[PDB]
Design a protein around this ligand. Sequence first.
Ligand code: Y01
Ligand code: Y01
Ligand code: Y01
Ligand code: CHT
Length: 418
Amino acid sequence: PLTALSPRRFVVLLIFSLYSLVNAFQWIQYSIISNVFEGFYGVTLLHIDWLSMVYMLAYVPLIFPATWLLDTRGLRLTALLGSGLNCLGAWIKCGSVQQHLFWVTMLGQCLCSVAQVFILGLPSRIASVWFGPKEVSTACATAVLGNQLGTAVGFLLPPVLVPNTQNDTNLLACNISTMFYGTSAVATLLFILTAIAFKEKPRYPPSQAQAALQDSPPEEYSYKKSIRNLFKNIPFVLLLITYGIMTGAFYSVSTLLNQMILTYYEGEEVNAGRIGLTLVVAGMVGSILCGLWLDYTKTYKQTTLIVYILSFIGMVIFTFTLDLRYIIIVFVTGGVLGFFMTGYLPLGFEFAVEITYPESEGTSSGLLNASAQIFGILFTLAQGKLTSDYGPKAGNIFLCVWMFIGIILTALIKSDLR
Ligand SMILES: CC(C)CCC[C@@H](C)[C@H]1CC[C@H]2[C@@H]3CC=C4C[C@@H](OC(=O)CCC(=O)O)CC[C@]4(C)[C@H]3CC[C@]12C
Ligand SMILES: CC(C)CCC[C@@H](C)[C@H]1CC[C@H]2[C@@H]3CC=C4C[C@@H](OC(=O)CCC(=O)O)CC[C@]4(C)[C@H]3CC[C@]12C
Ligand SMILES: CC(C)CCC[C@@H](C)[C@H]1CC[C@H]2[C@@H]3CC=C4C[C@@H](OC(=O)CCC(=O)O)CC[C@]4(C)[C@H]3CC[C@]12C
Ligand SMILES: C[N+](C)(C)CCO
């Protein structure tokens, strides 16, 4: 048919990549300065850990209903839901700046968590709907890098924005209010932009395949049947477990970074945020490089196993170098660990998608993300308890053992797939 490329696609790609980014920020704003919020609200570190774990807890039950809603009602409703929920959560947080109003900020974080469910799976759908065959992969990569950059900014900003001033509660409240109001204003602007500009689909089909998909009549899809068939697929299950372990380890490290660093270095919250930013940026660079390598070679199993082993080595090095009382070595080890660990996620995701070619990409993506969230919750809880009881090294060694198990599982996966 007659297919054309619409300029609005770029706007559609930009606005999403922005508000998704904001969501990622709101995920890690509390954790990076978790000590400050713990002092302000008079709560335990477990409360701040739950502020991060609410995202993971909310994603798992709502992912598949969200997928059904996206399929039935289109892209515009999902985008509006995500942006509006993020803005509402930010506004709720804005009113939670008091020593006795932790539940209000928890409600706001829950709103942002529910928003996330409408955002994570949107990249591929937007790229297919609005971009031609050559630009689909680049658009999806940019969309995911948006969330990764949001996590990096969530690492970097809060430490600078909110200094640790427990002596002066009023100054702490003022700084927290400034951060919350800035985030809420950005979220409101992004929601307004999404409402004004975001559209269901371009007037022409971006690609011949998308044109055929539009022409093809809708077909009922049974998510339960697809999930059952996927679970019958043993290599897919193994890859799911390994990817979940890796992503949960990343989530736990991100959430507990402040607790680990503050144990050995005092008054280094800004440097903790910088270390998190270095981890995320090295992860993005490694993701790009590993994507190029896999596209050039297409060796799913070999590259996956090698990257898993290197990530385990980096995690062990970080574990046994954290307490050296030198922050530069912490920077370097965090950079290497982020490189290898985060560069793995796209590789494993593509391997899982290819392994389950007959099955829909949406179901496999949702299962992978749900496994990641579950492993993140488990690792966060266990590692936080271990760090509190015995010290960061215990939880780090626990993560090392889980990464070793993940390597063993990855090696077990049997597939000649390219
Ligand atoms: C609507 C969707 C997003 C689900 C919402 C779920 C949350 C509202 C729940 C899930 C788990 C809950 C947490 C589970 C465990 C704890 C530990 C609990 O700690 C104690 O009671 C002991 C505190 C101390 O050590 O003094 C305080 C509540 C809290 C943070 C809970 C707060 C509410 C949470 C985050
Ligand atoms: C990675 C390992 C460690 C955990 C894997 C757990 C999964 C098997 C769970 C996680 C989320 C679950 C889903 C969450 C919500 C729903 C919606 C629920 O919808 C209904 O009740 C109606 C379905 C219909 O219309 O038939 C059906 C089960 C399902 C797909 C669940 C099936 C089981 C899932 C995929
Ligand atoms: C796949 C899953 C089921 C494996 C789970 C294994 C855990 C139970 C292991 C992993 C890391 C272990 C911890 C690693 C290091 C330590 C420090 C150790 O410290 C000591 O008191 C002795 C050493 C010293 O003097 O420092 C006490 C045990 C503990 C908490 C270990 C307890 C057992 C842990 C949590
Ligand atoms: C996708 N994030 C890393 C932003 C949240 C995990 O729950």
